[PDB]
Design an enzyme around this catalytic site. Structure first.
Site, PDB file in Angstrom:
ATOM      1  N   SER A   1       0.784  -1.212   0.000  1.00 22.38           N
ATOM      2  CA  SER A   1       0.000   0.000   0.000  1.00 22.38           C
ATOM      3  C   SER A   1       0.826   1.276   0.000  1.00 22.38           C
ATOM      4  CB  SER A   1      -0.994  -0.020   1.152  1.00 22.38           C
ATOM      5  OG  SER A   1      -1.833  -1.162   0.982  1.00 22.38           O
TER       6      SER A   1
ATOM      7  N   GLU B   1       0.149   0.531  11.036  1.00 18.14           N
ATOM      8  CA  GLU B   1       0.056   0.718   9.600  1.00 18.14           C
ATOM      9  C   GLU B   1      -0.817   1.841   9.074  1.00 18.14           C
ATOM     10  OE1 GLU B   1      -1.861  -3.278   9.367  1.00 18.14           O
ATOM     11  OE2 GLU B   1       0.077  -3.904   8.550  1.00 18.14           O
TER      12      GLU B   1
ATOM     13  N   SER C   1     -25.061  11.492   0.047  1.00 13.75           N
ATOM     14  CA  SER C   1     -24.351  10.228   0.326  1.00 13.75           C
ATOM     15  C   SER C   1     -24.892   9.428   1.502  1.00 13.75           C
ATOM     16  CB  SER C   1     -22.859  10.494   0.533  1.00 13.75           C
ATOM     17  OG  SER C   1     -22.246  10.837  -0.693  1.00 13.75           O
TER      18      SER C   1
HETATM   19 CA   LIG Z   1     -20.507   9.969  -1.924  1.00 12.29          CA
END
Ligand SMILES: [Ca+2]
Ligand SMILES: [Ca+2]
Ligand SMILES: [Ca+2]
Length: 517
Positions: free
Chosen positions: A164, A346, A489
């Site tokens: 990552s 992490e 959202s």
């Molecule tokens: Ca969104």
């Protein structure tokens, strides 16, 4: 016989010197009470214990919200041609990050698209590679994401892996990717290096393509003083030392400097070792807590070992001025370190809010030395994961823990449930200076939650950032895989409770012991 410093702390702890064994006395006489902190801030043994205690309490201020389990699906775009086998397969998708604005951390709008880079691979295979995904900017549907394919192409192998990092838009609208190049040719070790490449994309009629990957090179893999090198690790590892040089987060400050904030272990500046058990700074509680902790550490070989090898670090370095061909300009001492306490912290992440810099990270508490703390976490909740957090007045300045101990989020469901999460990654929210949207992957890898259940994208949820250096989880949730919070959202239907968080039979399911430790 106790020296005078040992004698001082024993009395302040309100314990009788005659009740101490000879082994205990000789431990206290080894204690170093006057080591000056290195630059930066430590997660102390007391901090770690408080984080675990908070997790055990399941305080709604910090608990990862319950997700309604019936709603959770595999991500369609995670069924894709696999980087190693070259065949279309349903993959685990785990650690993911959006392309962001380098200055503000906002999810970038690239020609009307939002862009995410993700680790994917076949469950139960060594198949660690990163893929580019896209969707229309602001689109809220998991299934509208599409996979462009593996950044570094097909015909890949486990000998050279990608783990990552982060990604931003360059000034010319190319993408600068920071990632972890992992070379496993030296006896299958995870030799990690922070790497970078530039991605050139094109957009034709609703489809985004990867046109070219340029300037792929190693940026940094440790110096030895500030951060542990691969050679250092290899020199002394018999199987108890972690190796970390990864998860690089790029961010630009008000002074026009690009920095990497990354995961590592400390170097010779303040190195792991048995001596750390005898460094009073690492404890950070009152005298009675500190002494009790020392004695507990010494009474258990596992804990002693862990304490001996623990030296996780969140590092920072400054990059040179070349956007597309970054090299190290300056190294600094870690922003955060956990000598004696943990050997793994992490996905470090910095978000700027107002005139402050918030450093977050994910950690599994079963990588810490305090076995009692994380086993109690497992016993109470069935998992031991958390997100921790700090705040500073400048990007390189002194970071102070949020919520006293650094706790920010705590695990709320067992690790082998469908709705278990990890790899919490906070993204800022457009036109909000006191909130971030927490993204995560959901369902632990390699089929542990059951047949047909792949690691997928979690629903995201708001975390309120308070002015007094605390945070509060909010009951505001999105659909799975939403990287952009706005008024469109919210999907309150996704929020579960202790009951709906579980599929039928999960409450009574057998524990996956390898997973939780
Ligand atoms: Ca969104
Ligand atoms: Ca190829
Ligand atoms: Ca270590």
């Amino acid at each position: 016989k106790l020296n005078k410093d040992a004698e001082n702390v024993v009395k302040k702890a309100g314990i009788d010197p005659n009740s101490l064994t000879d082994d205990q006395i000789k431990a206290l006489n080894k204690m170093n009470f006057s080591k000056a902190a290195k630059s930066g801030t430590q997660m102390t043994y007391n901090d770690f214990q408080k984080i675990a205690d908070t997790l055990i309490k399941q305080d709604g201020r910090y608990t990862v919200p319950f997700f309604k389990a019936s709603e959770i699906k595999n991500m369609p775009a995670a069924t894709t041609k696999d980087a190693q086998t070259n065949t279309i397969e349903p993959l685990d998708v785990w650690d993911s990050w959006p392309v962001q604005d380098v200055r503000t951390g906002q999810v970038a709008n690239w020609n009307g698209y939002q862009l995410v880079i993700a680790m994917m691979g076949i469950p139960n295979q060594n198949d660690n590679h990163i893929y580019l995904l896209y969707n229309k900017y602001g689109d809220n549907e998991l299934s509208h994401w599409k996979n462009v394919g593996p950044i570094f192409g097909y015909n890949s192998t486990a000998v050279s892996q990608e783990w990552s990092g982060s990604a931003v838009l360059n000034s010319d609208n190319s993408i600068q990717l920071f990632y972890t190049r992992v070379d496993t040719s030296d006896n299958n070790t995870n030799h990690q290096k922070i790497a970078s490449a530039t991605l050139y994309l094109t957009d034709n009629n609703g489809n985004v393509s990867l046109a070219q990957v340029a300037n792929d090179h190693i940026v940094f893999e440790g110096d030895g003083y500030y951060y542990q090198t691969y050679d250092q690790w290899k020199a002394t590892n018999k199987g108890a030392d972690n190796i970390a040089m990864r998860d690089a987060h790029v961010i630009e400050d008000d002074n026009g400097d690009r920095y990497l904030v990354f995961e590592a272990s400390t170097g010779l500046e303040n190195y792991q070792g048995e001596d750390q058990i005898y460094n009073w700074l690492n404890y950070g509680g009152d005298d009675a807590f500190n002494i009790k902790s020392l004695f507990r550490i010494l009474s258990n070989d596992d804990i002693k070992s862990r304490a001996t090898w623990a030296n996780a670090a969140i590092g920072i370095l400054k990059l040179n001025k070349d956007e597309k061909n970054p090299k190290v300009a300056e190294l600094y001492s870690p922003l955060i370190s956990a000598p004696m306490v943990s050997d793994e912290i992490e996905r470090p992440n910095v978000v700027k809010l107002g005139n402050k810099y918030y450093l977050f990270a994910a950690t599994r508490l079963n990588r810490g030395s305090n076995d009692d703390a994380w086993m109690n976490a497992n016993y109470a909740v069935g998992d031991n994961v958390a997100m921790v957090g700090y705040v500073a007045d400048s990007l390189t300045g002194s970071y102070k823990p949020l919520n006293d101990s650094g706790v920010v989020l705590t695990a709320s469901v067992p690790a082998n449930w469908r709705t278990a999460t990890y790899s919490y990654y906070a993204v800022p929210v457009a036109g909000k200076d006191d909130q971030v949207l927490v993204t995560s992957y959901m369902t632990n890898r390699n089929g542990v939650a059951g047949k047909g259940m792949d690691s997928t994208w979690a629903p995201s949820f708001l975390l309120q950032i308070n002015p007094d250096n605390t945070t509060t989880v909010l009951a505001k949730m999105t659909n799975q895989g939403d990287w952009i919070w706005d008024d469109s959202s919210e999907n309150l239907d996704m929020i579960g409770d202790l009951d709906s968080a579980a599929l039928p039979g999960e409450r009574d399911k057998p524990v996956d012991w390898d997973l939780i430790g």
